[PDB]
Structure formats: structure tokens, C-alpha cells
Amino acid sequence: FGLYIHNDTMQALGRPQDMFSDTAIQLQPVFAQFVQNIHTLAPGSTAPNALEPVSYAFGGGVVAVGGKIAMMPIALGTADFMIHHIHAFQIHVTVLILLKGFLFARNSRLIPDKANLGFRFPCDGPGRGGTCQVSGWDHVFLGLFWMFNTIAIAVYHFSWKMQSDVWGTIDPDGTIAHITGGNFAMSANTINGWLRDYQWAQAAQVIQSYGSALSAYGLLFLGAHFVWAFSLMFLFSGRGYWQELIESIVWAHNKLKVAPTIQPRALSIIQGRAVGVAHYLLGAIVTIWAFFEARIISVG
Amino acid sequence: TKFPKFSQDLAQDPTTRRLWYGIATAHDFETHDGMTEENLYQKLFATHFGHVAIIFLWTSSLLFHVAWQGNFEQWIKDPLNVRPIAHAIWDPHFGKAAVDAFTQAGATYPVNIAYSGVYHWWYTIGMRTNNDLYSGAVFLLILAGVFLFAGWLHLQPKFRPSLSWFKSAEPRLNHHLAGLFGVSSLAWTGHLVHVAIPESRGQHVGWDNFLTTLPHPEGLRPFFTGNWGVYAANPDTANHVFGTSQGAGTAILTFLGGFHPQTQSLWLTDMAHHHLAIAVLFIIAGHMYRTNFGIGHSIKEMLNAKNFFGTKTEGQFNLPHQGLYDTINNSLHFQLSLALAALGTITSLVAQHMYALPPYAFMGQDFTTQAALYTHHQYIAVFLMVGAFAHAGIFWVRDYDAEQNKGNVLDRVLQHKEAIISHLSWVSLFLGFHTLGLYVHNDVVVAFGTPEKQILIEPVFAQFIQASHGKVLYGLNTLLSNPDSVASTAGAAWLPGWLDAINNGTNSLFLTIGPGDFLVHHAFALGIHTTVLVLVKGALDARGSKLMPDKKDFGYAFPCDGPGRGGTCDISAWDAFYLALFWALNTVGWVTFYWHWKHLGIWQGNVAQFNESSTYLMGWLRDYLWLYSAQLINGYNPYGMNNLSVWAWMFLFGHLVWATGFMFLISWRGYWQELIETLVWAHERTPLASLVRWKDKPVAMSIVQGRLVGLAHFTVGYVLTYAAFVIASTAGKF
Amino acid sequence: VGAGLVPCSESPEFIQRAASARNTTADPNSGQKRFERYAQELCGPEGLPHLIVDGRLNHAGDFLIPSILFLYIAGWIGWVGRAYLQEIKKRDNTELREVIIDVPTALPLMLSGFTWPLAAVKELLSGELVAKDDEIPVSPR
Amino acid sequence: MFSASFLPSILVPLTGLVFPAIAMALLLIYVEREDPSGI
Amino acid sequence: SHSVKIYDTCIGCTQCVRACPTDVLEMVPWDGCKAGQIAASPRTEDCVGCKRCETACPTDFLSIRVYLSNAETTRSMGLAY
Amino acid sequence: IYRVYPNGEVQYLHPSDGVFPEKVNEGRQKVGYVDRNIGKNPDPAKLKFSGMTTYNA
Amino acid sequence: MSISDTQVFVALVIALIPGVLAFRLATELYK
Numbered sequence A: 001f002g003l004y005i006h007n008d009t010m011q012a013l014g015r016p017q018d019m020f021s022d023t024a025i026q027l028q029p030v031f032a033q034f035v036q037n038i039h040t041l042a043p044g045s046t047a048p049n050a051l052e053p054v055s056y057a058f059g060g061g062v063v064a065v066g067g068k069i070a071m072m073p074i075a076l077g078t079a080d081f082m083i084h085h086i087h088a089f090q091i092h093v094t095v096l097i098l099l100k101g102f103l104f105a106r107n108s109r110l111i112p113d114k115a116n117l118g119f120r121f122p123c124d125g126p127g128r129g130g131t132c133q134v135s136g137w138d139h140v141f142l143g144l145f146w147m148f149n150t151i152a153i154a155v156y157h158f159s160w161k162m163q164s165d166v167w168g169t170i171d172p173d174g175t176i177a178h179i180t181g182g183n184f185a186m187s188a189n190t191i192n193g194w195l196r197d198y199q200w201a202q203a204a205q206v207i208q209s210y211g212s213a214l215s216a217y218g219l220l221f222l223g224a225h226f227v228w229a230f231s232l233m234f235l236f237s238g239r240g241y242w243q244e245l246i247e248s249i250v251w252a253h254n255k256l257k258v259a260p261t262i263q264p265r266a267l268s269i270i271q272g273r274a275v276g277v278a279h280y281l282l283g284a285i286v287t288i289w290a291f292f293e294a295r296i297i298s299v300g
Numbered sequence B: 001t002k003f004p005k006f007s008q009d010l011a012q013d014p015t016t017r018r019l020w021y022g023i024a025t026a027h028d029f030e031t032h033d034g035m036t037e038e039n040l041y042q043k044l045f046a047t048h049f050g051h052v053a054i055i056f057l058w059t060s061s062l063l064f065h066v067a068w069q070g071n072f073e074q075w076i077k078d079p080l081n082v083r084p085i086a087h088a089i090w091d092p093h094f095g096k097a098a099v100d101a102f103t104q105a106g107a108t109y110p111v112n113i114a115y116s117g118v119y120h121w122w123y124t125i126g127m128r129t130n131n132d133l134y135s136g137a138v139f140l141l142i143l144a145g146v147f148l149f150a151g152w153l154h155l156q157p158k159f160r161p162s163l164s165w166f167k168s169a170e171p172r173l174n175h176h177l178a179g180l181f182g183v184s185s186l187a188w189t190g191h192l193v194h195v196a197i198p199e200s201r202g203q204h205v206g207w208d209n210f211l212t213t214l215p216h217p218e219g220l221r222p223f224f225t226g227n228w229g230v231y232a233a234n235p236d237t238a239n240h241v242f243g244t245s246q247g248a249g250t251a252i253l254t255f256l257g258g259f260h261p262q263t264q265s266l267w268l269t270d271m272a273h274h275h276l277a278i279a280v281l282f283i284i285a286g287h288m289y290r291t292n293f294g295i296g297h298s299i300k301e302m303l304n305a306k307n308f309f310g311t312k313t314e315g316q317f318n319l320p321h322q323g324l325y326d327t328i329n330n331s332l333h334f335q336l337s338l339a340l341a342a343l344g345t346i347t348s349l350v351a352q353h354m355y356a357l358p359p360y361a362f363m364g365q366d367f368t369t370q371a372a373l374y375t376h377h378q379y380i381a382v383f384l385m386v387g388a389f390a391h392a393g394i395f396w397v398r399d400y401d402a403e404q405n406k407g408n409v410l411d412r413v414l415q416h417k418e419a420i421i422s423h424l425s426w427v428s429l430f431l432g433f434h435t436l437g438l439y440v441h442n443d444v445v446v447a448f449g450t451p452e453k454q455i456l457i458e459p460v461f462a463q464f465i466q467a468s469h470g471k472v473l474y475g476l477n478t479l480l481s482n483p484d485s486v487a488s489t490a491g492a493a494w495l496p497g498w499l500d501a502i503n504n505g506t507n508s509l510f511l512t513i514g515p516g517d518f519l520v521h522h523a524f525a526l527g528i529h530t531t532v533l534v535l536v537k538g539a540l541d542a543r544g545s546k547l548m549p550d551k552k553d554f555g556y557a558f559p560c561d562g563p564g565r566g567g568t569c570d571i572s573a574w575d576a577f578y579l580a581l582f583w584a585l586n587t588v589g590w591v592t593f594y595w596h597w598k599h600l601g602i603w604q605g606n607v608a609q610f611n612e613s614s615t616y617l618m619g620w621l622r623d624y625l626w627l628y629s630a631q632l633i634n635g636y637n638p639y640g641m642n643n644l645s646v647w648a649w650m651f652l653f654g655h656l657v658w659a660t661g662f663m664f665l666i667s668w669r670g671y672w673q674e675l676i677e678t679l680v681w682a683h684e685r686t687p688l689a690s691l692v693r694w695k696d697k698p699v700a701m702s703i704v705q706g707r708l709v710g711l712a713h714f715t716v717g718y719v720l721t722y723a724a725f726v727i728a729s730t731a732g733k734f
Numbered sequence C: 001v002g003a004g005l006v007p008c009s010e011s012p013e014f015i016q017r018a019a020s021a022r023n024t025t026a027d028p029n030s031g032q033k034r035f036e037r038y039a040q041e042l043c044g045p046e047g048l049p050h051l052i053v054d055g056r057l058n059h060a061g062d063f064l065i066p067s068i069l070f071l072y073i074a075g076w077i078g079w080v081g082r083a084y085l086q087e088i089k090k091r092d093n094t095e096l097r098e099v100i101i102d103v104p105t106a107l108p109l110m111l112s113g114f115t116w117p118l119a120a121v122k123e124l125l126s127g128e129l130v131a132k133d134d135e136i137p138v139s140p141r
Numbered sequence D: 001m002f003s004a005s006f007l008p009s010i011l012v013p014l015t016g017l018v019f020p021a022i023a024m025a026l027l028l029i030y031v032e033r034e035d036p037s038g039i
Numbered sequence E: 001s002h003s004v005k006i007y008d009t010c011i012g013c014t015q016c017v018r019a020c021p022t023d024v025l026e027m028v029p030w031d032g033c034k035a036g037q038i039a040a041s042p043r044t045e046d047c048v049g050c051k052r053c054e055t056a057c058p059t060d061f062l063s064i065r066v067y068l069s070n071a072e073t074t075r076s077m078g079l080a081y
Numbered sequence F: 001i002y003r004v005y006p007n008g009e010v011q012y013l014h015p016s017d018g019v020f021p022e023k024v025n026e027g028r029q030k031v032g033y034v035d036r037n038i039g040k041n042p043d044p045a046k047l048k049f050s051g052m053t054t055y056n057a
Numbered sequence G: 001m002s003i004s005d006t007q008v009f010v011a012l013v014i015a016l017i018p019g020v021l022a023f024r025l026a027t028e029l030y031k
């Protein structure tokens, strides 16, 4: 990531020769290229009783039908490097959190009663400073946040590549006129480009994609942000505040003789954490599926 | 015992948190070990001195720098177009097009643009040349130094004021409210009629010629005869040009009112007469109380009046007031809170009396400057008030005695706080529910293709007050729209020009409104309502709660009270402060964007977009969010650069620290310590690096410090991006 | 009804929209009809009508009677809820039935909310609606 | 440039770099001082 | 380390003394109620801040409290390193 | 259970009551007492210009 | 117009009056 932001700064600093793509400082994933190659010429010798390669993204001819691509070989240049490496990065940290909760489940260097006490409990008092969030399923909380990040950027990458240099239209010459125009070799190297050259395309119609017969489905993307902020509200706040507000409303209701017999009590902090993370995930995934659903409708 | 000396306790702990806590108390004096009152009073005296000294240094800084490498005179020649100069630019890491996109105004070095706007105000005061402000810097510098020395002197034993000398109020009262600004506004008025008005009329009056030439040819005649209309001689003509004499005038104190047809600002003679008015008014207000001499009003005993005209009283307005007037002299948090609240209120008012009453020349045409100033001052204002409420809260724990106020008005407030907070929650819930319901009404109805099935309100109370001030646009013929009513022969004695101005609503003078303004104004109401809600809740819980009454002795401090019932986190009397800060930030964002959209539509007159897409929120996030950013977003890109790359960097930097804030806020201190254990385990057992050891044994952060740093990151992230956006947009769209 | 607002009858853009006014529902007269129903109000440059709220008989009924209807129904529901709650407590099965609704008793209470306003007025004059500041023992502080 | 001398060329680094350096060095050695004296 | 605070509501069930894993309590002879021996803190210096003790106090407005101080050390912070 | 100093010397904190019953003895130690309710609590403005705690009335 | 060595002058007025005056006003409060 610091390498990435380094190149970001260089581009913003009129020092373009310090970029990292083919037109600048070099790095090339030779291993993937060589494995794909040794996959290209497989039949005949490794596969005698076999006619065509297993796929056509490794090698072979660009297979298609109509003015519509079916499969062409995929190109791995420079931008592949850091993308795969940050994939590995996030997977590593995810394993870190989960395995950490795994090993340090029964006994920590400070808490020798964990398994002696349970695995679903909020904290162990303000001893040793703080100890809140020392169970295991909070470890998996953090882990699920991280895997959200992982899979989100993974689907970003997949969609953008397979709409940038794999899919589009075709001419009688087999001329593949892709949808976007090969934008990775151009902008998928700096951060500001990543917001520009992805979500400009991913939303420029959803603003106006409503307003006729086969458009009226005003999508709940406008709607999901609300649930997202309402989500994050639950995270940052404690509970005693809500308990006291509840007690005041109870005072009023009791003054007007409408006191509910079953005495309301505020949520438990683990309950609140759970509902917060649930609403967070829901809003985010709703947002993103709305995004690319409408985006495909704009081409399909 | 060396660090920290001001607390013998905190220097007895081998954990890095010492340092963290070492620099979060050095400005909390009355918590240091062993210092009674007069020590604190005298050193506060000295430290306040130092504060105003560094203020003077700051002023000298900006003024000397603009005197050095600026284009103030090149701004004199072509005012309405030439752009000011901030200072020089020097960084080896810099780009390429930077020097290529900076050198303007005839300059050859990398000039930096200026936006605060000292040129207009200064020329309004009547400056002409670099040497003027050169000498200005040179002398207020020595002023600052002398003031510093003055601060030093009273530290010596024979120059130590008395605690009684601090408690005695009425002398400070009179000396300030009469002799601090009354006489000072008099002196400013003298500088106006002696220097400012001449320079406005084109005549140069230096530091020597002022001794022999006159303000007015009729001068000194009404001095002691009483025909003051003589000084109200021929006013300036309908074609006068500042700094020139084309159609000049020879009137000193006028009451023209409205605007000047060239600078579209306040008239300078109106300013002088104004200042004179308030000066003499404060002077007559000066002798209003009782001094050490034997006449006047004894404050601490005026309201000690419980009898008049037989029917004695319960106090003034018939309410108890006995026993609290010592508190304002006992506590300091009380006075501090009052001052903070007052200051914030009048700052907001200032921020409001700028975009309609241009005080200086060229103010209205230059959009970016006034816009930045407006949002700047309002932002300054918002949490300025939060300071007042927070210090009110901390006063409630430290500075408060029970029996001394038994049964007075304060206790009668505390006895019924309940209904207050309940009804406040009520009105907040009501307004929120209904405004959101009307919004979503609009959203779904327009989401079907038929907009006529959707509600449009129309405000008329502001319309009535608008016409009733004297607006004719709506033709209601009431109160200066009725030119024949009883009050239709009153107001200003120069109301014709004011009427020409206000009828000419072409400028920013009480523009028409519609349904949207109804909506957003109710939104403001809601915002401040919940803000004051959480603040007063924290304040009135500064003592204790129903399910935790003890906290009065726990202090304005951490208390967490571990999981008694489901948990009791965030109960510590300024937990409320964080929440209030969020609730203030979003409010001020709402209001400043409303102002921005209003004036943006006013710029090119195309008000259609605002009124057309103010109802449903899709229109809000579609018409103004991204429809102004491509003018900024491509400041740098794989193809070229501009003079905005630094501003895109502003954007992204702010976003980064913003998310960092989330990181600090969510994760808590029960996980960031297990791995520090194993990470200490490393150094102990690797070779070739186990040589070095620990200055101090490192541990994880603290809880309150974690909250504080998270909030700081969030607020700094919020500040930057919005500023960059607003100034870039204003300077890129005009 | 001022503020520079043209009547929705003679606002040209109003009828301009009315011409191709998208007939919403399954009946061809849907759109046009509603535009015909929108001649009583007064439009503006936006071509869409604003609502005036003054008791002024130009638009009085267009806001008053809906308000009063809401007051009716809100009074009914609040009244029947409070009455049900008061009733439950005279059973000594309080929180057992707090989740199990006693339908044969919950019905007539709902059905008997016909004259809530004036009856409530009576409980006001009789003072049958509030308990005493100190009798209510819910401790503050 | 203008009528001033080289000064804006090189007077930033020492204020930018070396003065912070001595500042923090002196500060650190201050926060470890013995008892009961300290400068 | 931190400070401990005792009251009169100690019924004498002695669930706190069996809960504190830090040996900071003992039932010194009393006379008032049927307890005859009321809890107290003789060995504060090993206080930990876990406050599992009052969670074991059944008395209405639990009889023990802990005023969580500011003079922490390697003992009060509880480090094995 | 034995605590040990850096010098190699040992402390005998516990067991001090045999099986750690923590409530049985014929007379016990006596250092420090506070047998008082909370309704009358220490106050900021009344207890001042010194550094004592919430106990001395 | 603009200035000359007189700016070295205005630099020279500093570092004795404001400089050590502020230095003393700082060191008064016992580091």
C-alpha cells in the first residue's frame, strides 16, 4: 500500500518517470505468464487424445459468436502484481485475527480463566487498564469486517477487468471493441483514478436510471446509506445513556398512568454490537448489488 | 521528581502513559500540587498577558509578510481584478507546473495567492504604500515586546497585586465598558475624520501634515455653538470615486443609509456617526454603577432588594435571587461559560451581517473570499458554544455549594428539570418524524412519475415580515409597503436611499423564498434542539443519575462502573460532549451547504435548480454534489496538472484521517494488549539486537485517550475536505 | 394567496403538463381527471400548486379537516390503549397476559372508544387523569 | 526575485530540521532527569 | 494502589471474599447486625480493578465499593514482564 | 504459596488462615475503620486546599 | 517601493527585545 501511495504522490508531483507500470519503473509477474504459456500448447503431447485447450483465456483463438465476445486470452501486465499482493495481504491479516482468537481462546498471558468463564462475554472489568473485547467472537467480528473488505475489492477487480478487456462488442473482423477501453493500463495504478474511472461509470446512470416504463424501479441505493449510518450509530455509543433516557420517559409515562408493567431495559452491549454490525453489512452489500445490477442493465 | 514536577504522583510510574498524561494537565493549574489562589490569579494575569502578546506577534507576522513580497499597490491600481499575494513559496520537493502555474501579477517568483482579504479592509482604512505597513509592523512589534516586559514585571515581589484587588468588580466594569472601547471608538473616530475620510476623498494626510490642515472648512464652528448640521454639509455626490475627487463632498457626519452606489458598501460618514454614537453612549453608560467614591448602584446589593411599595417581593420580577452574586465572583468556570456563550452568539451574528451589509469595498464581487470567511467564522462559532456548555457542566461539579443557594431560583430549576428534558425529547421526536415523513412522501411520489401527487408547502410568515420591513415585491401595502400608514413617515430620516436599495433586491438583500427554505429551516430547528438536548442532559447529570448518583464524587473523569447491568460505559459526564460534537458538526454542515447552494444559484440567477430539486433528496445529492467536482477532481491525473493538485491532495488526506478515526473509535483496549505481550517477547530473545533496552516499559493506550484521539482524527478529517471543496468550487465556477 | 402565484386554472404550463399528463392507474381518465381536480388551488412558475394554511376559506378545508381526522383517530387509539392497560392490572395475572392478549376482553374495549373526547373532558374536570407529584413515587435524582 | 537577499533560499532547513532535532533531543534527556535538580 | 470503600450494609454472606482473587479482604469482628464480622480491605496494595467482588455482593446497593485511583504501578497494572 | 524478592528472600503472605476460609478467627487484626453510610458524602468546595480523600469527616 | 538591508534591520530589532523578553516570560514558571 505504501508503494501504491508513493506512486500516487509521484503522479501528483510532476515526476511521472517514477511511476511503476510498463511505461515506467518495471516489475513483471513472470511466473503466471510462464504457467499460462506451458498451459497454452498442452494438447498433442500432454493431451494427445484432446483437440483444443481447456480454456481460451490462457491460449488459443479468440472464441466468440456474433458481435459479442465469448472468451479471449487475458493479459497480465504490471497492475496485476500489487492487486494479487494486497489480496494475499488481507487474507493474511484475516487469518491473523481468526487464528489469534483460536489459539488465545482458553488462556491468555493475562486472562487465565477464559475457557473457565465462557466465550460469549463482554469484558472483565477495567483491570489492567481496559479489557473490553477479549472474547473470541469479537475476534470474528473484526475478521468479518476484514473479509468484507477482501471480497468487496475482489469483486471490484473481477468486474472491472472482465468489462474492460474481456467484454464489449465485435465487428466482422472479430474486432473486439471492449466496453471501457482498457483502463487498468491507464488509471488502475493511483487511488484518485480508482474512484474516478470506476464509480463514475458505475453510477452515472443510476442517478437518472428512473423515470419511464422499464426504468421506474427507483433502487434502494439512495435507501441503503440511511441504514448504514443508522448502523454506525449503534457502534460508537455505550448504553447507560440510553438507559437514563429510558428512565426519564418512564417517569413521564408513570405520571400519566400509562406505565408499561413489563419494565423496558436498554440493549446489552453485545446485543447492540451485533445489531450494529448486522445493519452495517446489510447496508453495504445492498448498496453494492444495486450498483452493479443497474450497471449490467445499462449494457445487458 | 523532575517530570512531571507539578504532580509528584505522576512521576512514580514506569509506563509510557506518563508522557501521555504529562502533557494533558500542564494547563490545568488548580490540579497541580500545592498552589493556593493568589498564585493562580497572578500567573493567570501573566499568561493572559503572554496570550495577547503572541496575538500581536501574529498580526505583525501577516502584515510584515504582505509588506515584503506582495502586490498591494498593484492591487490599488486595478482593484476589482488584481488578486492579492500571501507570501513566497519554497519547497525542493515541488512539482513542475507549480512554478509554471503560480507566477502572476507580474511576479517572477512562486507567489502564493491570498484569500483572507486584508487588502480590502486595509485600503478601506486608508493605506497607500508598502512603507505604511512596514512601519506598522516595526512598531506594533515593539509594542508586543513592551507588553511582554510588563507581564514580567508583576512577577517581582513588590509588584504583586492583591486578591481583593481582583475581587473588586465595579472599577473593572466601568473602566472596561467606558474606558476600553468607548474612548477607543472615539479615538478610532478621530482617525476616521482625520485620516480615513481624506484618503477616501483622495487627499494624502501623513504624520506631519495632519497637524496643520482641517477636517472641515467649517471646522470648529459648531464645536461650541451647536449647529451640528453645518458639519452635515454637502454630502458626497452621486458619482464620487474613492481615492479620487470626481464629484467629491465636504460632509463629515452624514446619515445617508443604504449603500454607496460605487462600493455598494456602508457609507463611511454613517460609520463615523455610528461610532460616535456608541462611544458617547458607553461613556454615559460608564458611570452607571457604584464605585469606591460613594454614589451609584451596588451590584451585589441592588438585587439584594426584597421590598418595594409595600408588596415586598420575591425578588426582581418576583423571583428569588438571594445568594448567587458571590458565585460569579467565587467561581471562574461560571464567568468563562458566560463569556464563551456570548462570544459564540455574537460571532454567529457577525457571520450573518456580512453577506448583506458589505462593510468594505469590493466585498460583494469577490465571491471566494467572503464565502470562505463566512463558513470560517460560523465554524469557529459552533463549538465555541460547546465550550460554554462544557464549562457549565464542569462548574456544576467543582464550583457549587448547596446550603448557600437553598431555595433560590437555581434549585427551583433543578426541581423540575424532568419536564424540561421530557418535552425537549418530545419536540425533537416530533420534528424529526414529520420532516422525514414529508421528505419520503416526496421521494416515493416522484419515484412514480407523477409529481402532482406530492406536497408543496409555502411559507408566508417570513413573507409578511419581509413586506412589513418595507418590501413591495409582494404588494401588501403594510408598514413601508403602505406609504401612508402612521409609521410611514419615520425610520431613518434618509429612508429614500434605503428604499432605493432594498427595492433593488438585485443584490443580496432579503431574497425571495419557497418551500425548500421551509424544509431546511425546520431541519435547523431540529438540529439545535437535539444538540442542546444532549448537552443539557450531560450538564444536569454532572452530579449523578438515578441509576448512578454517586458520580458527583467520582469527578469529571473516566468513571465506567463495569458491567453492573448490561454495562455502564459512556456515563462520564462528557461522553455527552462527544455526542454533542457530532450533532453540532452535522448541523453546521447542513446550514453551510444551504447557504452555499442559495448563493450559488444567486450567482448566475438560475434559481430553477434549487427550487426544482429541493424537495426529494435525490435532487440534493445529484445537482450539487458531483456537478461541481470535475472542475476540481482532475487537478492532477495521468495526463497533466493544474493549480489544484494540492487541493485534490487535501481531499484525499482528509478522507484518510477520517477513516483512521473510525479505526480508533471502533476497536477497544482489550485486544491491542495481547499482541503487545508477544511483541515484547521478541526483543528479549533475538540476538544482535538485544543490546538496546527500554527507556520506559511500553504498554497500550488508555481508554479516555483513545476516545479523544479518535474524536480528534474524525474532526480533523471533517474539517479539511469541506474547506478544500468550497474554495475550489467558488474559484472554479464564479 | 399572494407571493406571485398564478391560479392553477389559468397557469399555462399547468395545462401543458395536463395534456400528456401520464395517466397513472388502469383508467385512461386517471391523469386528466386529477389535473381537473387541481384547478381550485393556485400554481406558480414551477407549474405545481402550493398550499396555503390560514383558516382562509380559499384553502381552509384543504388542511383543517385532515388535521381534525388525525386528532380523532389518535385520541381513539391512545384512549383504548390506556383503558386496556388500566383494565389488565385488575386481574393479578399482570405479566402473564402482557404478551397473551385476552381477545374476549380486548374486543369490547376497542369497540367502546366511540365517545373518547368528551368522556376524557369529564375525567379532566373530575381530575381522573393525573396522579399526585408525590403519590407517583418514581424517584428522580 | 525581488529586492531582498538570498535569505528565503536557505533559512528553512535549520528551522525545518535541526532546530526540531535539538528540541526533541533536549526534551527527551529532560524527561529522564535525576533528582531533585533538572534543566 | 487504588482505594477501597466499606459500608454498613454488609450482611455477611461473604461472597466477595471468595470472589476477589487478589487477597484484599477479611471479615474483622463486628457487633451491629447478625454478621458479627464485617468485610474490610487490609491489603489494598494488590488491588487489580477487576471488581468481581461487588458483583458477588447481594446487598441492595452493594455494601463494598472501589474508588479507582491514579497511583498505578507494576503491581497494580499486573504485568508478568 | 511464596513470594520471592530479588535478593532471593521469600515472603509468606498466604495461607494465613489454614484453608483460606477468609471468615473464621477468634479476634482479628485492627488497622483503619470506616463504618458510615454514603448519604453524607465528602464535598469539593468544603474539602479544599489539601489532598486528603473521601473518608476523614 | 520595496526594501533593502532595512529588512536585515527589522530583523535586528528582534532577538534582543522580543527574543529574550519572551525567554524570561517563559522561564519564569520553573520548567
Ligand SMILES: CC1=C(C/C=C(\C)CCC[C@H](C)CCC[C@H](C)CCCC(C)C)C(=O)c2ccccc2C1=O
Pocket (backbone or CB within 6 Å): B663, B664, B665, B667, B668, B669, B672, B699, B700, B701, B702, B703, B706, B707
Ligand atoms: C491502534 C490502537 C491502540 C494502539 C496504539 C498505540 C500502541 C500507539 C501508537 C504508537 C505510536 C503513537 C506510533 C507513532 C510513532 C512515531 C512514528 C514516532 C514519532 C517520532 C517522530 C516524530 C520522528 C490502542 O492502544 C487503543 C486503545 C484503546 C482503543 C483503541 C486503540 C487503538 O485503536
Ligand code: SF4
Pocket (backbone or CB within 6 Å): E009, E010, E011, E012, E013, E014, E015, E016, E017, E038, E039, E056, E057, E058, E059, E062, E063, E064
Ligand atoms: S460485602 Fe457482600 S460478600 Fe462481603 S460481607 Fe457484605 S454481603 Fe457478604
Ligand code: SF4
Pocket (backbone or CB within 6 Å): E004, E019, E020, E021, E022, E023, E024, E046, E047, E048, E049, E050, E051, E052, E053, E054, E066
Ligand atoms: S478489583 Fe475488586 S476483587 Fe479485585 S482486588 Fe480490587 S476490590 Fe478486590
